[PDB]
């Protein structure tokens, strides 16, 4: 999801009436799941033999 | 008078620039004035005989 905000008009703000700033934000949702989790291996070992 | 805002892109500000709050007001004007106050009778009991 995204959402911009352009300088000007759009940004009337009172605490700035002169709209001289603008911004832009990505959002978005996240989420995992997992079947079976014997079918996966790790092994964790030590490096630079 | 009501104002309704929605979240989204019209709340998205510099404070908060996702926008992820929305809010809802009502409000209005409201006056009296009364001719000849002798009119009007009022009685003062107690209750549950």
């Given at each position: 999801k995204i959402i911009t905000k352009r300088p000007g008009?759009?940004?009337a703000?009172?605490?700035d009436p002169?709209?001289?700033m603008g911004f832009m934000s990505i959002?978005?949702?996240y989420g995992f799941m997992v079947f079976?989790?014997?079918?996966?291996?790790?092994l964790k070992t030590?490096?630079?033999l």
């Open positions: 008009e759009a940004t703000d009172r605490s002169y709209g001289e959002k978005w949702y079976r989790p014997e079918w996966i291996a790790l030590v490096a630079r």
